[PDB]
Amino acid sequence: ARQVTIIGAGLAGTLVARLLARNGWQVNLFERRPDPRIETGARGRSINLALAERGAHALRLAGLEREVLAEAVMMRGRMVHVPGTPPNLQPYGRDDSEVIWSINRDRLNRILLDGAEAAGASIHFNLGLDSVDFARQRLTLSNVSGERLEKRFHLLIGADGCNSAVRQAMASVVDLGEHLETQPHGYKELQITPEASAQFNLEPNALHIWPHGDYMCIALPNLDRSFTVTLFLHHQSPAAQPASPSFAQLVDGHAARRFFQRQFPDLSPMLDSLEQDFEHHPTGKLATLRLTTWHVGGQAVLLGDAAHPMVPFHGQGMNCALEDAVALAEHLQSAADNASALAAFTAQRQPDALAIQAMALENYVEMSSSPTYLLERELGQIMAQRQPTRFIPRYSMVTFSRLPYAQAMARGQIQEQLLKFAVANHSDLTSINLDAVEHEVTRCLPPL
Ligand SMILES: Cc1cc2nc3c(=O)[nH]c(=O)nc-3n(C[C@H](O)[C@H](O)[C@H](O)COP(=O)(O)OP(=O)(O)OC[C@H]3O[C@@H](n4cnc5c(N)ncnc54)[C@H](O)[C@@H]3O)c2cc1C
Ligand SMILES: O=C(O)CCn1c(=O)oc2cc(OCC3CCC3)c(Cl)cc21
Ligand SMILES: O=C(O)CCn1c(=O)oc2cc(OCC3CCC3)c(Cl)cc21
Ligand SMILES: [Cl-]
């Protein structure tokens, strides 16, 4: 049986462990954290993510989708909250088959852990990867106390997140051609209780947004009607705009409350523990990291966040990580050797990871922010009605299809260009020749 060592029992690592182990591979998975399935007396916060078709299909292939969806909250559309106006629901798709799912991160991780062990993988917790000796095929792990353990490896999979120790080790034997693009927004996680969400009539079957230009809040529902609220806000105020809001200006919980009362007045009354959450929850960091190289011969490979950290504005990081796990398991299972598998995996996934990284950055302005843009959307809907196999909105291609991200981006750009060009020099839909725009759709977009 072929052997593999996986670092990181997160989302991609556990899925790839199950897929390989059920194909008869001898799988050892090492995780720095303790086993979350071991119930303790600790009070762990109910953080969520959005599961879309790419992640759902990966779980479906693994035979875990039904179990994950049993605890997932349907999000039918985007609920935009702007003070003065009642909340407006913008459905994401054509019906309830085109929705996204709010899932508890910890619950998803537990189902994946159970799944990997059921398939025969061995999971070793409280062991963090410190270093790799590629020449000797040995690695060094340690617990929180720094007590070291050395292990031999045959194939190493780095599924160890955005601050990957496997990636750092690879960078000592190969030039990974890394480019780090820091993101100016930090994030803070806050909570809305089930009582508060019900009192203020907050729709449970929607993804909620409080746009505010340079900053915003997003809320995702939980099964118990609580919501996680995430504030995206600059770590520091820029030189050009010193007065502009930032985390640096919010010195304590009381400052955060005054900021919410002024900038998010319909949201602040729903945030009962705002002061405590602000002070006790650390401010998260966001970034985009692009690598030229994801592997070292047939010895080691990166996937998910270890390979391609991205900004979370499209809710596609986990979806991409699960899609990566399927691709990696498929290449490893069927290749002539590990070296061929790793090179083919990298060649297939790298253009798609770059496309989703770019689309995730672009989606911030879509959420956080026009007379011309409403005319564009109206025109885009007519085109989607007239040519349903040619004109598919970019959000739908990314979220509800398994079309390669690079193709979704390329088709999305043609669509965005067509709409922009068509509405330019026109104030309304009645002055636009619909058949001429449709001819450009049939000319530039092959049917899918
Ligand atoms: C604010 C925010 C919101 C997000 N929202 C969404 C969303 O709605 N939808 C979505 O699709 N994605 C979302 N994402 C992205 C998503 O969280 C990640 O892309 C996803 O978790 C990546 O999966 P992974 O397995 O590659 O990494 P991880 O899930 O981070 O797993 C890495 C694992 O490796 C372990 N580890 C780390 N270092 C070591 C080491 N040295 N040795 C051993 N183990 C180690 C970690 O403890 C962890 O268990 C969000 C991310 C952020 C920051
Ligand atoms: O354009 C839209 O209406 C939604 C885009 N999007 C998506 O489909 O899933 C998301 C998940 C997101 O983050 C959720 C986590 C922050 C802590 C929970 C964000 Cl920031 C954006 C998206
Ligand atoms: O009556 C009207 O409103 C204009 C119709 N019209 C036309 O006569 O030629 C067009 C060519 C167009 O696009 C060419 C390239 C931009 C990406 C393909 C468009 Cl989008 C619209 C037209
Ligand atoms: Cl994301």
UniProtKB/Swiss-Prot annotation:
GO MF annotation: an example: FAD binding
Its job: Catalyzes the hydroxylation of L-kynurenine (L-Kyn) to form 3-hydroxy-L-kynurenine (L-3OHKyn). Probably required for the synthesis of quinolinic acid and the siderophore quinolobactin.
Record-stated family: Belongs to the aromatic-ring hydroxylase family. KMO subfamily.
Effect of residue 395 to A: Abolishes kynurenine 3-monooxygenase activity
Record GO biological process: anthranilate metabolic process; kynurenine metabolic process; L-tryptophan catabolic process; NAD biosynthetic process; NAD metabolic process; quinolinate biosynthetic process
UniProt: FAD binding residues: 11-12, 31-33, 50, 105, 129, 305, 318-319
InterPro entries: FAD-bd, FAD/NAD-bd_sf, Kynurenine_monooxygenase
Pfam families in the record: FAD_binding_3
Residue positions binding L-kynurenine: 78, 92, 363, 395
EC number(s) given by UniProt: 1.14.13.9
Effect of residue 366 to A/Q: Strongly decreases kynurenine 3-monooxygenase activity
First-tier enzyme category under EC: oxidoreductase
Key words of the record: FAD, Flavoprotein, Monooxygenase, NADP, Oxidoreductase, Pyridine nucleotide biosynthesis
Protein name: Kynurenine 3-monooxygenase
Annotated consequence of substituting residue 367 to L: Decreases kynurenine 3-monooxygenase activity
Pathway, per record: Cofactor biosynthesis; NAD(+) biosynthesis; quinolinate from L-kynurenine: step 1/3; Siderophore biosynthesis; quinolobactin biosynthesis
Documented effect of changing residue 363 to D: Abolishes kynurenine 3-monooxygenase activity
